[PDB]
From a paper:
DmCE1B_ct forms two discrete globular domains, a ten-stranded β-sandwich domain consistent with the CBM48 family structure (residues 294–393) connected via a short linker (residues 394–404) to a three-layer αβα-sandwich (residues 405–656) typical of CE1 enzymes.
To investigate potential ligand binding in DmCE1B_ct, we pursued a protein–ligand complex by soaking crystals with methyl ferulate (MFA). This disulfide bridge was absent in the structure of the apo protein, which was crystallized at a lower pH (pH 5 versus pH 8 for the complex) but may be biologically relevant to stabilize the dimer formation. Two MFA molecules were observed and modeled: one at the interface between the two CE1 domains of the dimer, and the other close to the active site in one of the protomers. The MFA bound between the two protomers, which is far from either active site and makes minimal interactions with protein, is likely an artifact and not of biological relevance. The second MFA molecule is found on the edge of the active site groove positioned with its methyl ester ∼5 Å from the proposed catalytic center between the catalytic serine and the oxyanion hole. The MFA in DmCE1B_ct makes no direct electrostatic interactions with the protein and is not positioned in line for catalytic cleavage. This is not greatly surprising since the enzyme lacked appreciable activity on MFA. In DmCE1B_ct, the positioning of MFA further away from the catalytic center is possibly due to the smaller loop corresponding to the β-clamp or helical region.
Author numbering:
A (entry chain B): 295 to 493, 508 to 571, 575 to 656
B (entry chain A): 295 to 494, 506 to 570, 576 to 656
Amino acid sequence: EVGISASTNIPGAQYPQILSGNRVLFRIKAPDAKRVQVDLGKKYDMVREEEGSWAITTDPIVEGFHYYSILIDGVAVCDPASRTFYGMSRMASGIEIPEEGVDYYNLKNVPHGQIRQIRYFSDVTKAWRRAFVYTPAGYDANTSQRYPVLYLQHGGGEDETGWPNQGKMDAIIDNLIAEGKAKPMIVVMDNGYAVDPSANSALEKVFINEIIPLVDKEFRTIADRDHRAMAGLSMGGFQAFQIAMTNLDKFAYVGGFSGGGIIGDFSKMYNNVWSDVDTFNKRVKLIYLSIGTAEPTNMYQTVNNFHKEFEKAGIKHVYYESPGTSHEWLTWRRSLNQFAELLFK
Amino acid sequence: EVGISASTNIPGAQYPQILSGNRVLFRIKAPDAKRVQVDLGKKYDMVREEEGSWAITTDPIVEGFHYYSILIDGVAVCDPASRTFYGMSRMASGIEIPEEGVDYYNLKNVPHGQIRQIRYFSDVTKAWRRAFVYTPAGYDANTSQRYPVLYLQHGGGEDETGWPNQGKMDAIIDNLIAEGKAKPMIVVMDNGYAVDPSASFQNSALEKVFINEIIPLVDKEFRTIADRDHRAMAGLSMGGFQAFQIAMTNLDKFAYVGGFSGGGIDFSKMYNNVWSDVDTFNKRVKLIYLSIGTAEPTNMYQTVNNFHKEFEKAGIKHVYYESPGTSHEWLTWRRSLNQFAELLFK
Ligand SMILES: COC(=O)/C=C/c1ccc(O)c(OC)c1
Ligand SMILES: COC(=O)/C=C/c1ccc(O)c(OC)c1
Ligand SMILES: [Cl-]
């Protein structure tokens, strides 16, 4: 009958509510609509209730974060009751379905780092750009301390606000550091779209010639490959491998979360970076690949086949299959939690 | 005709387009909708094209920032083509109509500060809160320097993301500091709501959050000059009423106060008789600033104008600014911040 308002609700909005069994109760006032649906997992038709309102209770929804839409007369729009997130190439509603007994991505009373917005003009794209830079707890007070850096990228249809919002990255990293499971580190989150209008080679040039120099001159970093990592989800995973594998002198740790390498002579990929497997293994401290067990087959296969080629070649790596999750943010929160614990050790 | 895609459009979205005369062409794919409207100043009915997109060209829209909505069958929602902003008590679409020959809120090749997110847990509300804090360009370079602080508040139906987003505050402040028109300063932007933990513009709980939590936190975590001659509070609409309520009842902590389309409502006994003695009061306060758009709804315009008149009747020194041609909308507040910041800490 009555549940708990989702944590993604706008302040003051009672609905949607999460009921027992993780069913979700949606309501909306729409007296003149012909049809009202909610698309969460599948599409559900709402039914008319009192005072022009419509409502529906869904089937159980899998735990985690989900983009969703309300459909008015078949038009997919943001639910006025929920926060929005930049995903699926627009501002989309999202809903959080809590995991029982899991709290690593939740806020805790531990020392907190700070996410900073840094603006810069790109001479590659000829546009103003923006990075978000997480500094770990104590950064401002520990002026003699220098830190390793993780460059962390969002997926297709997302932007630089993804990891701070959908990814809950500050809680994940703050909590790992506070528990002694990860080293204090700076995390840099930029935009995976870069078009050079004078012509992804453009994104690589932005990272190598603009973002890395910006972070290394504005923050107290340990500016060497043994203290520099790159990872991303989906498209950002393909970009992390493209950029790191063609700039291996700058990175010793690389991660792809539901993304990474499009596979011919696999031994020649990235300009012969791993033509000699034993030498490549000596140069890289970590290669990490993950995928949800419930991802769409085409997305699962691309990443799994990359892993399979690494296994065949003897390229050392960590491979994680996230049980019960799909091409959605819980898979990526779990991946960051695992990956960050392995970094800079 | 030739149109310019608005800067608030999602990347890749051609519409909405700004046409000559600042008319706006809106378009949405909705083949099975019964009615599609756009609410921008007033409601316009859009008209369905053969293939199921609906379109309308508005009347000329006044320059500045505007919240807007698409209505499908009377349901107000976000336009899929635009960015969203927290305003009108939800996530709402916004559109930017550029001003000819004005660039103080645009990004320039000047030294840039940073806006950072700081989290803190409030004992008053028993909830996690967050502030956005602007630090000026040489903050990390000049560790022997400390800075004055402006506490800057959003309006009703908004939140702490308002000044960084709708308000373009980092461009405004970066540019003023770079040109030598404002002193280097820290700006703290928090949330104007403080809900009682047992729940299910005067707010004693919000005052306690600022006085007992936000100000001490900022003075401890940042290199501030922690005294009233280097502490200011201002806000727009609801936040302007809050700035006056909090500053006037904690005058030993603030010497500069601003209300942008806010501050208002006998008069001589307001804020526990703070201005009983006007001559002493004028010597205690270094700046009182009030602004209003000339085109604001009458109840809002007259509220601020009447507050100004009461100051004129009492002999209370202040700056009063009318923003020409703008209403109860963000361009009024960008102009107000630009003026107020130039006056601070002098
Ligand atoms: C969970 O959300 C976040 O972490 C936000 C971080 C953030 C930091 C600085 C900004 O100027 C900003 O602008 C909206 C956002
Ligand atoms: C700047 O003034 C404001 O923001 C609002 C003023 C205001 C005035 C009269 C009212 O009856 C009212 O409530 C409907 C509000
Ligand atoms: Cl208000």
